[PDB]
């Protein structure tokens, strides 16, 4: 049974994910040092550009609340070792030594808690800018520590922790016990995500989108630890001016809904442009998705899966609250007439299996329409007339609301 | 041979289609009139909130430029029958008794000019408006005959008319000699396209669906030769639609573009605009990728024409044929890592075509200039290419290679 | 408007056997090899002299049809290579007559389907490679059709139909198609005429052929016209006469859901098999015929005169429903074997198919393979049946599985 | 590192055939029929008296394997159902020596076996329904099992392997298998050892995997013993013989199921059921003959050929496999080729192209009718391109397979 700090994350449903660094300048990916096998000055001299000068922490979290995120997942320094806040001593590679001069993460946090969003730090384990990192892994433990120590005690409480780069090193021992113990330490209630079962102290483990079956939740009688996936709109995660490879709208909202269905939380991802700024690409998305969030908010942060199935041929699933089961539809279409066929005018039956009480009535959240239903209750059986979208609009994915009798 | 204007035709390639009309202000897609089974007394009063305050000609003739468009169809009259021009006297349904009180068509046609874009008129054969329709066709095709000439003398030399509703009546006469006709006195050099072998010889395009997998037919070989032409919108309606998330990706509209010029036609993309006339945020970002896509594949996406070369088993790869180059379109290609970081585009990718029989000197990416490695058969007729994944940081779609001959 | 009582009698006949058999079967590569192996004509033309038929019983055939569930049996009395397996008295001296077997095949063929109550019908090649007429004389080559038919419609009793293929090799030509198919009609007015063609090419034809992918009801012509049937085809690996080292068969699977479709498309549908050179049913094709042959034994209340109806299926589904005057049954796919709580074969969860159509209140519904009565909800304002479709029980698959529905 | 020689024997074997036969042949509605029909267990093994085995011939069976190309047998000895195939020498009289039969069924087929050059192997059920010991006192239902095999590995002669099936129906028990193996190999030390899990001890040789198994299996870590793979594919959707199921595959599938197999290493066991008296049924026959004919044709590669670290061009399923002599390319997706005037499909050129080819070549050309075909190469980047002409008319193989002869 989930501790209340991980019961309270799995109800905030869809987080942001904010990439940016010094690679943002550079507008061809997160890791290009490495893997455009940068030379290490010339790439790190890019601190000296880093103005921060559109850097708005209070649009970050207008977008967020718009978009109906509840946290930001924002890098505070990534694989190439830059720091986004004061280090106090630990590091001269950090926003105190580039012209922008201000502690972001101190403005990040500020707008997050005006806006009632919990702010997380990402934070790479796996670091480029250290040689400690190479040639004394145990002393690049005590950096990275001290480096998690200074967002721990210098900006009140903090949401969580988001650590990616442990699969650098499969096999070494990264002293998670005493990395996650000081966070424990300091910030009680903060989320621990590590991005590969690795430690006791880690609440949420990371899965690929396309995990089709509900998340294990840890071994029977022990822990219980949350899911969560990732996506991008594009193939980066920074910036990457020349990536047009940009998903559909509609799959981000696919997506979204199917982490609900398998029992995670979402983050999607923006990559800032080098000064700062959302790029307008990155708005667009984030204005489809807030329709949809904002239509489906009675059940995209409560809702949990639930042991019903959809018919054969389907990718529709149901998500249970205490007050109400919702089905979530696919693949209809719009609704024309008699003369102008769309696709959608045919009744369209669709079943699930495993509602066992008898209703009262079901309707559409987008605009309240009331849907006929057959239900067999000793083989829990309900076939609804999914209607089609009427001609105007598409949700992609459709909410229906079940009132119990 | 294609006549001369139809030669222009082809050459433009990419054009934008704009809607905007009354539906606009609904936002719940164009034909809401008929589909949303609307009062045509309350739907019809849209007309005096028909303001255009926000509409610019030459934002819209700018986004064109930009994203690599060289034509413009805008909605004159949809089925709803609302003019945006000066009817001068025909109706009282125009723009002229709307609060805009400005010729939306002349202000269109200005900006055109001046990017050197060629305006084209949709204009719906099929209307909701005028009782003529149902009750009096022959009268109504008269009506019909008249708003096409207002557009055909008042407005300089347009570049093509996009007629819309034949479709309705499939069996009737609709005239079209001497509503094709009269085009052809006035505007002789415009290009005629039907939405709907042919149904007269004066059109010049048949419209196609983006899906149709073979080249395009062009009339039998003793008659005129005709263009095609598909259409794209970024959702599921061609009007604006506030509520429909059903977005495309980008990427599916740059293979489309990249299809159609595969097989022989054009493409439009269609934008719906917001009732008082602005060019939504959505639509500019789709524009922006695609403007990238267009100004990296210009060398070929104009001139460049089908040929009888097949690629190989598997891959949905294409040529295109220039004078001076032919080009390889090349389509599923991911992006190159490192040895210890794989993205999947790393190893050596060999892509083949069947009918290419001249000794090559050279072949090159037009994104980045990289030479690629090919061998060839000239007996068979076979050229594979390792076709490089993309660099970090860069993901084209459809990539594109210019060979050099020998 | 209604089809005419032949026409009728041919839908009714669900299922037939197409039986390739020639001087090609001996070389069994194939039943258009003589053209497209380049071979000589004078030394392929010499496999006359080695045909002897020894293997051919003429009730073994009508045997496998019968015992598949076919109706009909369409046997190839003369192929491109046109060689006649009939007396042809006098026409042409390349028949079975001047072969050593020395029996008119046809005759045994026509005996053997009577006694099975099976219509034979009559393969014709129209496109010969034999007659110097078809290159010199045209005109000339239709009066040698025209006889070739003729005898088949005077010697051999009554003929189920006429199956004719190769007018499109000469697609401009004048066939005259009038004078042929009138012939028939004087002397086999019961006769189905069937045209494979690559508007009907005659106002005589009574069926048409179509690619068995077709996906929609065929089209019968419109309500002043004549209604004319359709037809589909399917052979069992890549050839129709025989080929020893064309390994690419069909599943089993495919060919009982293909014949399933025929069916909903308001389609015959014929299942081919190629002979042996002396006119043997291979051992690979009698496989085919006791699986087809279990499905068709079970669909029997249904694949006769079952017809297509304005039922279509749920989502994701490629169920259909078939009707008669009596009941209604629907045809459900992609079914999975039932297993147990502990032993999980994928059929045991409870399987809701919808179809949108169905105005009638029901009483029962069972399934043809075991009368087990399914569980259903009936909304009968938008037409919507709901069937709880049971998985298989253990040890059995019939592919497309058949419920029957009794209305109140 | 390096394969036992026993291992790489087996892994020379390729194709063997599962014959599935018990007394559950007898209602031909599937080997499982005894306890997920619910059978009452007294009724359900009545079927001892009618097991004459008048229809078995294990001369006949063996020509059959040899027809296909099959190189093992792997026969149940028992089933979950528990009755033994062969004389248990007291250990239960639930055997076939208790039947009408009364003939050592196993002796007939291990002699077999032996002249037709096929090695003889032990299907034995682990998870058994006819014991009492199995569900009240497990440790004793150890000595049972153990026992059994004791009889198959010492009264036999030379045994070619065991294929162990049950055990995940108790995935926490301990089955004690150091002992039962260790048994084997004291008295069977050339045994091939396979356990269908769904590596178990150190004495287990092969390992089982899915049909769809997509890449070059796993052999073990590095400095580790290593231990082959096996698929298996049965022609309709059971093993034991099941009259109403007619949802049986294509030929061609099981052609290709084959041919993948050996792409990622593995060998493949195509299943028959026998009829409740021992003859193999005429369905099975059809498909061994289809496949016999292509297995011959694949002679030279289908025993010898390895997976190698060649990959196939984009949106293509071809593949390649090594021998010491000769690379072959074996293709798939081929049409057959007509005319000018009558297209089939096969006639345009088809480049076919391979990474990871990096020695020039003389000539490569069709193993089914030694049909030369062109190819280029660039030797840098280890390219190789051929033309992959389509079938001649009357033939098709579905996996098509040419020879490479380097200079």
Redesign the interface.
């Known amino acids: 049974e989930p501790l209340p700090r991980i019961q309270h994350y799995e109800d905030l449903g869809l987080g942001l994910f904010i990439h940016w660094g010094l690679y943002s300048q550079?507008?061809?990916?997160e890791?290009?040092e490495?893997?455009?096998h940068r030379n290490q000055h010339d790439y790190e001299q890019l601190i000296k550009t880093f103005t921060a000068a559109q850097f708005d922490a209070k649009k970050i979290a207008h977008a967020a609340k718009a978009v109906g995120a509840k946290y930001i997942v924002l890098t505070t320094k990534h694989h190439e070792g830059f720091f986004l806040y004061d280090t106090k001593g630990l590091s001269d590679f950090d926003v105190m030594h580039a012209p922008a001069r201000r502690d972001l993460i101190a403005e990040f946090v500020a707008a997050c808690r005006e806006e009632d969003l919990l702010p997380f730090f990402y934070m790479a384990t796996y670091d480029w800018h250290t040689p400690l990192y190479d040639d004394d892994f145990p002393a690049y433990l005590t950096y990275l520590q001290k480096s998690v120590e200074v967002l721990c005690r210098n900006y009140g409480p903090v949401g969580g922790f988001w650590f990616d780069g442990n699969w650098n090193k499969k096999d070494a021992d990264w002293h998670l016990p005493e990395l996650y113990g000081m966070i424990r330490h300091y910030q009680p209630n903060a989320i621990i995500v590590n991005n590969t079962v690795s430690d006791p102290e880690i609440d949420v483990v990371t899965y690929e989108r396309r995990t089709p079956d509900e998340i294990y939740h840890g071994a029977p009688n022990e822990k219980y630890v949350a899911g969560e996936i990732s996506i991008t709109l594009?193939?980066?995660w920074g910036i990457?001016?020349?990536?047009?490879?940009?998903?559909?709208?509609?799959?981000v909202?696919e997506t979204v809904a199917h982490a609900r269905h398998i029992g995670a939380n979402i983050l999607v991802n923006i990559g800032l442009t080098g000064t700062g700024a959302i790029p307008?690409?990155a708005?667009?998305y984030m204005?489809?998705?807030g329709?949809?969030t904002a239509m489906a908010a009675p059940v995209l942060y409560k809702g949990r899966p639930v042991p019903v199935?959809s018919?054969?041929?389907?990718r529709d699933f149901v998500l249970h609250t205490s007050k109400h089961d919702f089905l979530c539809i696919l693949?209809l279409q719009?609704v024309?007439?008699d003369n102008?066929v769309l696709g959608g005018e045919?009744?369209?039956?669709?079943?699930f299996?495993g509602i066992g009480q008898p209703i009262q009535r079901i309707h559409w959240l987008?605009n309240d329409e009331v849907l006929?239903f057959?239900?067999?209750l000793?083989?829990?059986?309900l076939?609804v007339?999914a209607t089609g979208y009427?001609?105007?609009?598409?949700?992609?994915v459709r909410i229906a609301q079940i009132d119990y009798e």
């Open positions: 550079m507008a061809v990916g890791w290009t490495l893997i455009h594009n193939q980066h990457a001016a020349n990536d047009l490879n940009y998903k559909s709208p509609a799959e909202i307008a690409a708005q667009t204005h489809l998705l329709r949809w199935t018919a054969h041929g389907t693949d719009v024309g007439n102008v045919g009744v369209n039956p669709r079943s299996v987008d006929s057959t239900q067999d000793d083989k829990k059986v076939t007339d009427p001609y105007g609009s598409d949700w992609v």
